[PDB]
């Protein structure tokens, strides 16, 4: 398993503009277009992103292109962030993907705000971080995904994604 497969599983793939779990216009593999309640604004954002007149629909190759850009951005964001980088640097390859996953879903500021959890991951107190991570709006709003990610941080294995 790798970060792309993991996220492809958590985000799914849609070629037409849709509303994510929070009600925001999104497309492709979890690519947020805008937070504005305007479909019109969303379509304009889509066009700008792809570079052509899409009329709200895209091809799979285009979805995958946005996806590569989005993973790249998440990783680079983590590395530029003073709170996130040290954690990411301390984690093994498998657990690092869980951190990337959270950043992809909530953004760098969202994640950097999980200070207590971050401190526990850094200290390698897996079980404790797991409990702390679960005491969040994130867990209560998207429990199945949060469970998969948290299990990944706890065990350092892909078991939660395995056989899905
Ligand atoms: Cl809560
Ligand atoms: Cl969920
Ligand atoms: K790492």
GROMACS .gro file of C-alpha atoms and ligand atoms in nm:
model
  167
    1UNK     CA    1   0.000   0.000   0.000
    2UNK     CA    2   0.117   0.354  -0.061
    3UNK     CA    3  -0.019   0.708  -0.003
    4UNK     CA    4  -0.193   0.719  -0.341
    5UNK     CA    5  -0.383   0.391  -0.288
    6UNK     CA    6  -0.465   0.484   0.066
    7UNK     CA    7  -0.613   0.819  -0.034
    8UNK     CA    8  -0.784   0.674  -0.339
    9UNK     CA    9  -0.965   0.443  -0.096
   10UNK     CA   10  -1.061   0.718   0.154
   11UNK     CA   11  -1.166   0.975  -0.109
   12UNK     CA   12  -1.305   0.765  -0.393
   13UNK     CA   13  -1.312   0.902  -0.749
   14UNK     CA   14  -1.580   1.119  -0.915
   15UNK     CA   15  -1.558   1.287  -1.254
   16UNK     CA   16  -1.846   1.529  -1.196
   17UNK     CA   17  -1.860   1.808  -0.940
   18UNK     CA   18  -2.000   1.680  -0.610
   19UNK     CA   19  -2.044   1.797  -0.248
   20UNK     CA   20  -1.804   1.644   0.004
   21UNK     CA   21  -1.901   1.535   0.360
   22UNK     CA   22  -1.903   1.901   0.472
   23UNK     CA   23  -2.119   2.019   0.176
   24UNK     CA   24  -1.831   2.170  -0.031
   25UNK     CA   25  -1.793   2.147  -0.408
   26UNK     CA   26  -1.529   1.890  -0.490
   27UNK     CA   27  -1.417   1.678  -0.780
   28UNK     CA   28  -1.181   1.403  -0.875
   29UNK     CA   29  -1.011   1.231  -0.585
   30UNK     CA   30  -1.114   1.460  -0.301
   31UNK     CA   31  -1.001   1.783  -0.478
   32UNK     CA   32  -1.181   2.066  -0.302
   33UNK     CA   33  -1.287   2.340  -0.548
   34UNK     CA   34  -1.432   2.602  -0.320
   35UNK     CA   35  -1.605   2.653   0.009
   36UNK     CA   36  -1.849   2.900  -0.148
   37UNK     CA   37  -2.208   2.776  -0.181
   38UNK     CA   38  -2.194   2.877  -0.551
   39UNK     CA   39  -2.193   2.605  -0.818
   40UNK     CA   40  -2.103   2.881  -1.050
   41UNK     CA   41  -1.795   2.968  -0.849
   42UNK     CA   42  -1.708   2.602  -0.831
   43UNK     CA   43  -1.723   2.562  -1.209
   44UNK     CA   44  -1.503   2.861  -1.259
   45UNK     CA   45  -1.253   2.714  -1.012
   46UNK     CA   46  -1.264   2.384  -1.200
   47UNK     CA   47  -1.186   2.551  -1.533
   48UNK     CA   48  -0.899   2.750  -1.384
   49UNK     CA   49  -0.756   2.429  -1.233
   50UNK     CA   50  -0.775   2.218  -1.546
   51UNK     CA   51  -0.705   2.486  -1.798
   52UNK     CA   52  -1.009   2.440  -2.022
   53UNK     CA   53  -1.383   2.477  -2.026
   54UNK     CA   54  -1.500   2.174  -1.837
   55UNK     CA   55  -1.864   2.244  -1.770
   56UNK     CA   56  -1.821   2.055  -1.445
   57UNK     CA   57  -1.686   1.734  -1.578
   58UNK     CA   58  -1.338   1.598  -1.611
   59UNK     CA   59  -1.149   1.299  -1.740
   60UNK     CA   60  -0.976   1.035  -1.522
   61UNK     CA   61  -0.635   1.146  -1.641
   62UNK     CA   62  -0.726   1.498  -1.534
   63UNK     CA   63  -0.847   1.367  -1.196
   64UNK     CA   64  -0.515   1.186  -1.150
   65UNK     CA   65  -0.320   1.493  -1.245
   66UNK     CA   66  -0.498   1.702  -0.976
   67UNK     CA   67  -0.438   1.413  -0.737
   68UNK     CA   68  -0.059   1.407  -0.795
   69UNK     CA   69  -0.051   1.780  -0.747
   70UNK     CA   70  -0.254   1.754  -0.430
   71UNK     CA   71  -0.036   1.486  -0.270
   72UNK     CA   72   0.273   1.683  -0.362
   73UNK     CA   73   0.128   1.995  -0.203
   74UNK     CA   74   0.038   1.811   0.115
   75UNK     CA   75   0.388   1.669   0.154
   76UNK     CA   76   0.557   2.001   0.077
   77UNK     CA   77   0.319   2.174   0.319
   78UNK     CA   78   0.409   1.932   0.597
   79UNK     CA   79   0.780   1.987   0.531
   80UNK     CA   80   0.746   2.363   0.539
   81UNK     CA   81   0.541   2.361   0.863
   82UNK     CA   82   0.738   2.409   1.188
   83UNK     CA   83   0.491   2.200   1.387
   84UNK     CA   84   0.446   1.923   1.136
   85UNK     CA   85   0.790   1.865   0.997
   86UNK     CA   86   0.945   1.731   1.318
   87UNK     CA   87   0.668   1.483   1.354
   88UNK     CA   88   0.682   1.368   0.999
   89UNK     CA   89   1.061   1.332   1.026
   90UNK     CA   90   1.021   1.108   1.333
   91UNK     CA   91   0.770   0.867   1.179
   92UNK     CA   92   0.830   0.542   0.993
   93UNK     CA   93   0.714   0.518   0.632
   94UNK     CA   94   0.376   0.367   0.706
   95UNK     CA   95   0.272   0.605   0.983
   96UNK     CA   96   0.394   0.905   0.775
   97UNK     CA   97   0.123   0.823   0.524
   98UNK     CA   98  -0.139   0.858   0.801
   99UNK     CA   99  -0.010   1.209   0.868
  100UNK     CA  100  -0.023   1.294   0.500
  101UNK     CA  101  -0.378   1.160   0.489
  102UNK     CA  102  -0.490   1.391   0.769
  103UNK     CA  103  -0.326   1.693   0.600
  104UNK     CA  104  -0.493   1.611   0.269
  105UNK     CA  105  -0.831   1.600   0.440
  106UNK     CA  106  -0.811   1.890   0.682
  107UNK     CA  107  -0.524   2.107   0.563
  108UNK     CA  108  -0.202   2.191   0.742
  109UNK     CA  109  -0.350   2.438   0.987
  110UNK     CA  110  -0.617   2.192   1.092
  111UNK     CA  111  -0.359   1.925   1.164
  112UNK     CA  112  -0.101   2.150   1.334
  113UNK     CA  113  -0.383   2.228   1.576
  114UNK     CA  114  -0.373   1.864   1.707
  115UNK     CA  115  -0.087   1.962   1.931
  116UNK     CA  116  -0.128   1.703   2.211
  117UNK     CA  117  -0.167   1.423   1.959
  118UNK     CA  118   0.134   1.542   1.765
  119UNK     CA  119   0.342   1.545   2.079
  120UNK     CA  120   0.237   1.187   2.161
  121UNK     CA  121   0.320   1.058   1.809
  122UNK     CA  122   0.659   1.219   1.836
  123UNK     CA  123   0.721   1.031   2.161
  124UNK     CA  124   0.602   0.707   2.004
  125UNK     CA  125   0.318   0.655   2.253
  126UNK     CA  126   0.095   0.492   1.994
  127UNK     CA  127  -0.193   0.386   2.210
  128UNK     CA  128  -0.216   0.715   2.389
  129UNK     CA  129  -0.210   0.917   2.067
  130UNK     CA  130  -0.483   0.698   1.930
  131UNK     CA  131  -0.715   0.781   2.218
  132UNK     CA  132  -0.627   1.148   2.198
  133UNK     CA  133  -0.681   1.160   1.822
  134UNK     CA  134  -1.033   1.017   1.864
  135UNK     CA  135  -1.143   1.304   2.093
  136UNK     CA  136  -1.210   1.532   1.802
  137UNK     CA  137  -1.471   1.665   1.570
  138UNK     CA  138  -1.280   1.480   1.294
  139UNK     CA  139  -1.350   1.142   1.451
  140UNK     CA  140  -1.716   1.217   1.525
  141UNK     CA  141  -1.793   1.350   1.179
  142UNK     CA  142  -1.601   1.094   0.974
  143UNK     CA  143  -1.563   0.805   1.209
  144UNK     CA  144  -1.482   0.523   0.956
  145UNK     CA  145  -1.208   0.715   0.789
  146UNK     CA  146  -1.073   0.846   1.118
  147UNK     CA  147  -1.066   0.487   1.250
  148UNK     CA  148  -0.861   0.370   0.952
  149UNK     CA  149  -0.613   0.650   0.991
  150UNK     CA  150  -0.585   0.618   1.366
  151UNK     CA  151  -0.539   0.240   1.340
  152UNK     CA  152  -0.259   0.313   1.096
  153UNK     CA  153  -0.086   0.546   1.346
  154UNK     CA  154  -0.135   0.294   1.624
  155UNK     CA  155   0.001  -0.017   1.449
  156UNK     CA  156   0.237   0.108   1.180
  157UNK     CA  157   0.074  -0.146   0.942
  158UNK     CA  158  -0.177  -0.132   0.656
  159UNK     CA  159  -0.427  -0.374   0.819
  160UNK     CA  160  -0.708  -0.114   0.823
  161UNK     CA  161  -0.688  -0.075   0.449
  162UNK     CA  162  -0.608  -0.427   0.380
  163UNK     CA  163  -0.889  -0.628   0.235
  164UNK     CA  164  -1.107  -0.336   0.130
  165LIG    CL1  165  -1.593   1.620   1.936
  166LIG    CL1  166  -1.623   0.815   0.753
  167LIG     K1  167   0.904   1.009   0.780
   0.00000   0.00000   0.00000
